[PDB]
Amino acid sequence: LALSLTADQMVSALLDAEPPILYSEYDPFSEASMMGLLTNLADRELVHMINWAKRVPGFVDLTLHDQVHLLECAWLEILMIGLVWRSMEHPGKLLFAPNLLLDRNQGKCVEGMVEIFDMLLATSSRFRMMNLQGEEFVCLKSIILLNSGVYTKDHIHRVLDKITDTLIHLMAKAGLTLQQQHQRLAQLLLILSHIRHMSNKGMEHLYSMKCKNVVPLSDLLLEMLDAHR
């Protein structure tokens, strides 16, 4: 399906595959209670992410083991790019959930966390200045799903070409010049390098939390974490 869709039809399919914004179990902070809240939430979103991924055109065509490999590789990038998108209207703050809007000061409650907070806030700031659109956001999110572990295949790259066609088409439709289109595409795609960075840091931190026995992790969360070894 993915390869023969018009760019408008690809946008729509991605838009109606979107998982909902969930809520936190919220309600003082401690390092244990904050990691608890964030991992409870992460685990619940992961179940929706599994269902969202199964509604991404092109993802549905892959083998089960390729699907798994890619979800494992990209799961935290994906949580992170959602978090950032959510946090656009809330500068200086991170909207993990509508009832869990955290600032920099609150990130300090957990050891090693504030550095990742700052990166996420910078990413969210970058999207705000670029005036990122939702249609661009869902394109980006699906690029991550298909791209991040694609080197860890021809079909995957063709679907990626399709999503590139789709981003451009949106930019063109919004009145941008050819030069502005390819520049903005580059800008968007270069941010994924930073999102990959933020993921590998987040992955190390979570692993440090498990090792220090800060928080108990569900099996799902422990499997995703374990795929990064």
Binding site: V47, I50, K54, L64, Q67, V68, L71, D219, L220, E223
Partner: peptide
């Protein structure tokens, strides 16, 4: 296979 594998195929 992992828990993930089922979750993904049945979901």
């Amino acid at each position: 296979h992992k828990l993930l594998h089922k979750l993904l195929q049945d979901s």
